[PDB]
Write a protein that binds this DNA or RNA. Structure first.
Lengths: 239, 221, 224, 467, 232, 60
RNA sequence: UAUUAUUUAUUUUAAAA
């Protein structure tokens, strides 16, 4: 927009929220029943993500078959219209996608009981329709909810949350404008525990300030698990 | 005078490092190993030649550098006593020692000398020995010079890469493996540098034989 | 009465034709062959099962109220003698069952010898680079010799690069053919010493091959 | 040189196979359904067959709740300081029976012999508790071992086997024993995912017992057993209780205990039935020595026999089976498949040909050489005893051909630039040249290369002699 | 008579006396001349006069009657798949190549198990074959699974000097510090094992350091300093 | 991820995993109790084949 | 013809006697 106040002395951010308030979290299950085994339409703030789980199924070619566990493939498709300016495909932009996809595979292959499904493959197709900051955390929430819809056995929830640090004030669920003005940490918290399955720090953060950011990060991620858990309760009781 | 080392890399069968003027090339050899389906030869050994530039990615310039380096090492290896096997020869150019946009002979010559030494360290059956030197002739005074500097290349009329094959104590020139010439020259200048090069390569193998013997002898018993 | 030369699309004759000869009417039964196909045509609203040529060459008829094998061989009679269709004849003439082929050993397994079919009978043969047209078969150990079929050694019968004259048995697994050399005239017909690194060897005994110049002897499964 | 123990049985050997398999059970301890109703033939058109007793027990009985939780494994008894307890008398059987009634887990294994017996005979039972190891002579207690049904069917006692897919059949056919509370460590090892599902793998790894495994196809009828065979027999069950403790805890951590106990019940529910009274549909719960409508068909493919000689292999397979039943021998003892294939391939006419075969004939063939020769001769003389276009011409006939030909004639009455840019440069033929001494090119004619081609092909095939 | 030689050099043996071809020399199938192909020390033994070249190498080539340490990488219906060295071609180990083998009994060997075998077939045009009991002499003592322990990578010359030459003081200097059991494979593998892990670890570090330091007289100071360090 | 019971005397079935002498769920569904078989029946799930099923299949 | 098979092995029931 323009020159804005990031965190006013009145404790209000540029979009009206406060330091510990999340963006609106509207999740949906079973949005694509005739196109995948697991579906989750993730709408976190202005982020709009479609996650499709196809599996466990027989691999198309025996060159990708494991006789002791399933193979996990995560495909992240960032649409040309996810932002304001219609971005053109860049050769450099392909490297950042591979790092995200690999980080997601290594994250959920440890939490999803792949041993129960041997000689099978689990394809995760993701389509990002719009992004507005905190896209990495929202991708995690879509995968967790889509795997549960597909009946894939997991050990616990994996909650994705993004925390920013402005001067000395940490801020929960950073949007696009806030990420452009501060350092951002994304976390992958496992269930109600304080254990992390993902930790990405892509900007400079003082070492003495990192301890507190993680505490508020894992805390706000528990709230994300509640929002995802409640959506599964309402969808199971009404059906 | 040139510098050369042997057995520098750990996770390969044979390695080497050849230095001339400012050109530095590290080469590694691994073989015989299991070849790929698109690589195996029914009767003889298959070669995988890879040269990588000091700057940027591998362009088509290094592709013709592979094809020339391949034409030198292929008759130099007893391929038939390794049927359905693979040999990976990888040359890494640390410093070019010359203008990459204009010349590539000082790197080709060092890759040949580095590959031969690495093939010796690996234990591949070699039919003979090999030496390679760069040759140039200066514009003003049409003088033939061996192992020219980077500045002399920018003042030369033609550049030459001579790769010879040595047998019997490094005295009998069995054949001329590679003679790559580009520039301006006639028939008289060719045999003038070819005769001059045959005696400069002859003292190179004599120095190479001393280099590899000073390293392999402490290994054996 | 059909034109000698034919183009893909020229109507030859329907499947039924009659004529009065010597006061005895006969009806011809024209069946499709290699180069034709029954095509229905319409000129007044009623179909007919006519034979239409689909090759470039001359039409030839043979016999087995009789049946007539109507076919079209590709090329001109002058071009067949010059053999200007050698590459096209190799791909169009697939190796059927019971044929004799000239292969090249490319892979030696403990119980089989993978080969590459290079020619096939048409002694005249047919053989085709970047053409991308080549067949391959497998010579199993059980089909190497007739004397003591089981418990043999293929390393002493073949080598990579040897040319082998072998008769096909049947389509192995779709991917490969099944060949055999259990005959005196089947086996290695052209080999070289030390996997091609030596001199041209020649067959002598039923399982012995030797080169004249080098004098070295190597055991094979020869054919003579 | 070994006397057949079948001759010493108090109950004779009935190889007649003239009625469905009647279970040798007279008392059903630890039962939920009365034994008086388990002897009713069940006929669902499958032949009428006696139902497997204890089937309702294995289906509707629960294991001890102690199996569900994890407990610390107890070390197996010392191997160098222990000795087996031979059980060959009726008095020594009750002393062990009252010992197996006072325990929680037992390891059981059996040995079998099938070469000189049609259906086969059990030769040794290996029982071991957490304290002692027992070796039971099932050849002298063949009529007395039915007392063990009080322990083998007690749900509070776990029977630890390893590959009981045959021991269950051997217990009910030769000893009248049934197992309720089976724990097959084969399905436990198969569920965990061990590379080898054998008992030797469990000994060498979980029990650290390195052993030579050759006393399996041995003759277990001989008495007394040799010292190596006694040590091998006791080893099959000595450590199986310690292995049971390890594999059970792993099945609980891996949530695979439910599947192993389910599969174990399906193994204990197997029912033995004669081949003549076997079900037509293949089932994994019923066993028969012959489970195919034509067993000689797989021999004709194994030995590559022409289909015209199937009437021969039929009369030889059926004759071989009836002879094996008469003398209580195995079909391979009277005539192996190696000799059966030679008789149908060589077809011996005279009696001398039946005796003189390269492999060598058995004594049954040697005595029945005249009978077998008369069979192949008769079957071969029965083989020699065993050994269009007007359909379409009537539809169209001949006078109607002039219509389809007139249709043809008037249907098909409806049937040069040199170059533009590249037409006079690409279709150009080959032109070869040669430079003279003055440097001028000289084009060779297309007839000069024609001379070269016919001169090479003629001089190529003209090689028929080399010195 | 031992001299350093190079490929393409003149073979210092007269063609009159019949000489046996060994590893290092090559007989051209065309010119029938005997010429070197490797670089090392030439050895000639003065009944039968054989000749070979001792060249430095690390990539093992399978040869018959060689004791090797292999890793099982594949179980199948009638044979194992064994790897004698990384990136090399795998070798075959049949189930019938064991003491007291049987077609009705599968061996209790899994992937990742170390086996001490003997190369019984080394055809250049075929896959090499190994066995865990000598098919020629009936031996079986020492062959089989190498349970626990640690395997070490050495060059082929260090492994051959350790198995054949009894004057190599590495085995002797190790016994002076700890009791162990060793298995030496000609494919550059050395398997050691001690009672305590601390002793096996010091044996691993010594054999590693002694392989790169060709000074044979320094093996005593290597084991002295290495075993003294693990005590801290 | 949530706890279904802390009673060790149970036989864990599908949708259920054992951890630290306690029992947790691996899917989202209803808890089932049959004799001693404790399991969780998930909502959406593919066909689970069993012994003796008259099925219709296509050759791949 | 799953106690059957795949050879540089796509087998995913090799257990009992």
């Amino acid at each position: 927009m323009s020159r804005l106040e990031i965190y006013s002395p009145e404790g209000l951010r540029l979009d009206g929220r406060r330091w510990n308030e999340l963006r609106r979290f509207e999740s949906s299950i079973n949005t694509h029943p005739h196109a995948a085994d697991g579906s989750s339409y993730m709408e976190q703030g202005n982020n709009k993500i479609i996650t499709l789980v196809k599996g466990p199924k027989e691999p198309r070619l025996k060159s990708q078959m494991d006789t002791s566990k399933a193979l996990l493939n995560v495909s992240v498709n960032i649409t040309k219209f996810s932002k304001f300016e219609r971005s053109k495909s860049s050769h450099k932009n392909e490297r950042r996608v591979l790092e995200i996809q690999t980080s997601l595979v290594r994250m959920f292959e440890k939490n999803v009981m792949l041993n129960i499904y041997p000689r099978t493959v689990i394809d995760i197709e993701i389509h990002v329709l719009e992004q507005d900051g905190g896209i990495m955390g929202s991708l995690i929430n879509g995968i967790t909810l889509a795997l549960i819809d597909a009946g894939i056995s997991m050990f616990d929830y994996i909650s994705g949350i993004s925390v920013g640090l402005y001067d000395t004030t940490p801020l929960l669920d950073t949007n696009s404008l806030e990420e452009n003005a501060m350092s951002t940490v994304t976390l992958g918290v496992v269930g109600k525990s304080e254990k992390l399955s993902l930790l990405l720090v892509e900007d400079k953060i003082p070492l003495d300030r990192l301890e507190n950011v993680l505490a508020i990060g894992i805390a706000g991620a528990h709230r994300v698990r509640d929002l995802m858990d409640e959506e599964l309760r309402k969808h199971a009781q009404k059906r | 005078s040139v510098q050369a080392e042997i057995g520098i890399l750990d996770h390969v069968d044979g390695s080497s490092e050849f230095v001339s003027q400012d050109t530095k090339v590290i080469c590694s050899v691994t073989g015989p190993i299991e070849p790929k389906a698109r690589q195996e030869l029914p009767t003889q050994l298959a070669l995988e030649i890879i040269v990588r530039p000091a700057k940027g990615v591998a362009t088509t310039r290094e592709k013709v550098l592979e094809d020339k380096l391949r034409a030198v090492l292929t008759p130099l290896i007893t391929r038939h006593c390794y049927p359905r096997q693979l040999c990976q020869i990888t040359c890494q150019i640390l410093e070019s020692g010359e203008d990459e946009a204009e010349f590539s002979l000082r790197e080709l010559s060092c890759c040949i000398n580095a590959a031969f030494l690495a093939l010796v360290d690996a234990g591949i059956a070699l039919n003979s020995m090999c030496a390679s030197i760069p040759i140039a002739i200066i514009k003003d005074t049409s003088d033939i010079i061996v192992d020219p500097t980077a500045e002399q290349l920018k003042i030369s009329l033609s550049v030459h890469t001579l790769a010879l094959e040595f047998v019997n104590g490094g005295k009998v020139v069995k054949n001329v493996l590679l003679l790559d010439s580009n520039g301006d020259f006639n028939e008289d200048q060719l045999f003038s540098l070819l005769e001059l090069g045959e005696q400069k390569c002859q003292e190179l193998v004599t120095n190479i034989r001393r280099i590899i013997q000073d390293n392999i002898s402490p290994r054996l018993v | 009465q059909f034109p000698e030369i034919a183009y893909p699309g020229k109507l030859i004759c329907p499947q039924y034709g009659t004529e009065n000869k010597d006061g005895e009417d006969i009806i011809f039964n024209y069946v499709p062959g290699p180069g034709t196909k029954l095509i229905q045509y319409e000129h007044n609203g009623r179909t007919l099962e006519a034979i239409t040529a689909t090759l470039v060459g001359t039409v030839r008829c043979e016999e087995e109220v009789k049946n007539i094998l109507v076919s079209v061989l590709p090329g001109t009679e002058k071009g067949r003698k010059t053999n200007k269709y050698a590459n096209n004849d190799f791909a169009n003439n697939l190796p059927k069952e019971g044929d004799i082929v000239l292969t090249r050993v490319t892979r030696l397994s403990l119980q089989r010898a993978n080969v590459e079919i290079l020619a096939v009978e048409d002694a005249t043969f047919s053989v085709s680079s970047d053409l991308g047209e080549t067949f391959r078969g497998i010579i199993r150990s059980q089909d190497v010799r007739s004397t003591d079929r089981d418990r043999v050694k293929v390393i002493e019968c073949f080598k990579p690069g040897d040319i082998v004259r072998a008769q096909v048995l049947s389509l192995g697994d779709g991917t490969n053919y099944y060949l055999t050399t259990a005959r005196n005239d089947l086996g290695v017909v052209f080999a070289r010493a030390a996997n091609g690194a030596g001199g041209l060897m020649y067959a002598t005994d039923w399982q012995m091959m030797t080169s004249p110049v080098t004098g070295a002897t190597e055991k094979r499964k020869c054919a003579k | 040189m070994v006397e057949k123990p079948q001759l010493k049985f108090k109950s004779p050997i009935d190889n007649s196979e003239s009625h469905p398999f009647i279970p040798l059970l007279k008392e059903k301890p630890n039962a939920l359904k009365p034994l008086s109703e388990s002897l009713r033939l069940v006929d669902d058109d499958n032949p009428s067959h006696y139902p497997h007793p204890y089937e309702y027990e294995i289906d509707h009985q629960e294991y001890s709740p102690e199996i569900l939780q994890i407990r610390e494994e107890i070390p197996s008894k010392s191997w160098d300081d222990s000795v087996p307890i031979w059980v060959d008398t009726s008095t020594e059987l009750e002393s062990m029976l009252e010992d197996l009634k006072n325990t929680k887990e037992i390891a059981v294994n059996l040995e079998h012999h099938d070469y000189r017996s049609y259906y086969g005979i059990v030769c040794l039972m290996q029982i071991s508790t957490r304290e002692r190891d027992y070796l039971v002579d099932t050849l002298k207690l063949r009529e007395n071992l039915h007392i063990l049904n009080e322990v083998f069917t007690n749900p509070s006692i776990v029977k630890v086997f390893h590959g009981a897919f045959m021991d269950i059949i051997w217990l009910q056919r030769d000893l009248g024993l049934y197992v309720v509370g089976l724990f097959d460590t084969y399905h436990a090892s198969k569920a965990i995912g061990l590379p080898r599902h054998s008992l030797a793998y469990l000994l060498e790894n979980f029990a650290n017992f390195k052993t030579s495994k050759k006393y399996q196809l041995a003759d277990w009828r001989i008495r007394p057993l040799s010292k190596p065979m006694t040590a091998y027999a006791r080893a099959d069950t000595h450590f199986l209780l310690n292995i049971y403790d390890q594999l059970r805890n792993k099945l609980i951590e891996s949530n695979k205990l439910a599947g192993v106990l389910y599969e174990s019940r399906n193994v204990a529910k197997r029912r033995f039935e004669y081949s003549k009274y076997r079900p037509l549909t293949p089932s994994s719960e019923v066993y028969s020595p012959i489970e195919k409508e034509s067993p000689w068909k797989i021999l004709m493919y194994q030995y590559n026999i022409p289909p015209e000689r199937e009437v021969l292999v039929r009369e030889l397979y059926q004759w071989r089976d009836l002879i094996a039943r008469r003398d209580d021998e195995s079909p391979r003892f009277v005539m192996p498949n190696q000799l059966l294939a030679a008789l149908v391939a060589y077809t011996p006419t005279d009696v001398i040909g039946v005796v003189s075969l390269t492999n060598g004939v058995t004594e049954h063939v040697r005595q029945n050489a005249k009978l077998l020769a008369n069979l192949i001769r008769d079957a071969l003389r029965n083989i020699k005893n065993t050994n269009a276009d007007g359909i379409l011409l009537e539809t169209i006939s001949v006078p109607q051909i002039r219509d389809v030909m007139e249709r043809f004639s008037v249907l098909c009455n409806s049937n040069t630039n040199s170059s533009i840019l590249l037409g006079k440069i690409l279709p150009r033929e080959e032109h070869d040249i040669a430079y003279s001494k003055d440097g001028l090119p000289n084009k060779v004619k297309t007839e000069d290369i024609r001379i070269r081609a016919q001169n090479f092909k003629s001089a190529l095939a003209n090689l028929e002699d080399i010195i | 008579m031992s001299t350093f030689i190079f490929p393409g050099d003149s073979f210092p043996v007269d063609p009159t006396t019949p000489v046996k071809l060994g590893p290092g020399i090559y007989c051209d199938p065309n010119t029938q001349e005997i010429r070197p192909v490797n670089t090392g020390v030439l050895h000639v033994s003065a009944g039968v006069q054989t000749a070979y070249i001792d060249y430095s190498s690390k990539r093992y080539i399978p040869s018959v009657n060689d004791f090797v340490i292999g890793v099982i990488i594949g179980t199948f219906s009638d044979s194992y798949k064994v790897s004698l060295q990384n990136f090399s071609s795998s070798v075959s180990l049949s189930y019938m190549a064991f003491p007291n083998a049987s077609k009705k009994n599968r061996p209790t060997l899994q992937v990742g198990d170390l086996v001490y075998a003997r190369v019984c077939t080394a055809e250049k045009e075929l896959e090499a074959e190994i066995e865990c009991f000598d098919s020629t002499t009936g031996r079986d003592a020492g062959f089989g699974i190498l349970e626990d322990g640690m395997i070490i990578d050495v060059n082929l010359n260090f492994a051959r000097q350790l198995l054949f030459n009894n004057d190599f003081p590495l085995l002797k200097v190790l016994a002076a510090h700890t009791k162990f059991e060793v298995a030496i494979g000609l494919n550059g593998k050395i398997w050691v094992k001690c009672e305590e892990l601390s002793n096996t670890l010091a044996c691993y570090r010594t054999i590693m350091e002694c392989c790169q330091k060709n000074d044979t007289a320094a093996f005593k100071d290597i084991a002295k300093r290495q075993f003294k360090e693990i005590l801290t | 991820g949530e706890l279904v019971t802390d009673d060790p005397i149970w036989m864990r079935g599908h949708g259920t995993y054992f951890l630290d002498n306690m029992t947790y769920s691996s899917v989202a569904g209803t808890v089932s109790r049959v004799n001693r078989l404790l399991s969780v029946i998930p909502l959406k799930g593919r066909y689970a084949p069993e012994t003796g099923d008259h099925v219709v299949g296509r050759i791949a």
